[PDB]
């Protein structure tokens, strides 16, 4: 798996600002119910949906991505609602994420 930096600018949907994805997981949840994890004891926060055409998709977020950090806050052992809260601060227009993603990128040049 690889680490990836993702930056998402929220889109104003009337009065709300939204990122355009859904989360699952958290240390309060039963990790057996998470289909995206490789290890079914992983209680981490996973991207379970990405809204087509939305800010997260355009920013490069992918379904199954594990969210490790949001704006400098570590997300590996947070509750589901703690994750929600960190992602939905009305004050914050931009969310910067570190995610892990399970995986020829070699640039080759003729001379
Ligand atoms: Cl919750
Ligand atoms: Zn698309
Ligand atoms: Zn910006």
Q: Burial level of 29, CB count in 10 A (0-12/13-18/19+)?
A: middle
Q: Burial level of 2, CB count in 10 A (0-12/13-18/19+)?
A: exposed
Entry field: residues in the chain: 111
Question: Resolution, in Å, please?
Answer: 1.7
Residue 82, phi then psi, degrees to nearest 5: -60, -40
> 28 C-alpha to center of ligand 2: Å?
32
Kindly write down the DSSP assignment for every residue of 46-93, as one continuous string: EEEEE-TTSHHHHHT--TTPEEEEETTEE-TT--HHHHHHHH--TT-S
Residue 35, phi then psi, degrees to nearest 5: -80, -10
Number of domains in the chain: 1
Domain hosting 110: range is 1-111
> 94 C-alpha to center of ligand 3: Å?
7
> Which CATH number characterizes residue 107's domain?
2.30.42.10
Residues 6+ apart with CB under 8 A from 91: none
Sign of the C-alpha dihedral, residues 24, 78, 16, 72? negative
Task: Tell me if 107 sits within 8 A of 63, measured CB to CB.
Answer: no
Residues with CB under 5 A from ligand 1 (ion): 80-81
* CA atoms of 37 and 40, how far apart (whole Å): 6
Experimentally, how was this structure solved? X-ray
Q: Which of 3, 8, 29 has the alpha carbon at shortest distance from 87?
A: 8
């Amino acid at each position: 798996s690889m680490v990836q930096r993702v930056e998402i600018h929220k889109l104003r949907q009337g009065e709300n600002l939204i990122l355009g994805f859904s989360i699952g997981g958290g240390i309060d949840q039963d990790p057996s119910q998470n289909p995206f994890s490789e290890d079914k004891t992983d209680k981490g926060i996973y991207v379970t949906r990405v809204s087509e055409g939305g800010p997260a998709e355009i920013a490069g977020l992918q379904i199954g991505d594990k969210i490790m950090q949001v704006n400098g806050w570590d997300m590996t052992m947070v509750t589901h609602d703690q994750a929600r809260k960190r992602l939905t601060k009305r004050s914050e227009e931009v969310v910067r994420l570190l995610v892990t993603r399970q995986s020829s990128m070699l640039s080759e040049t003729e001379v």
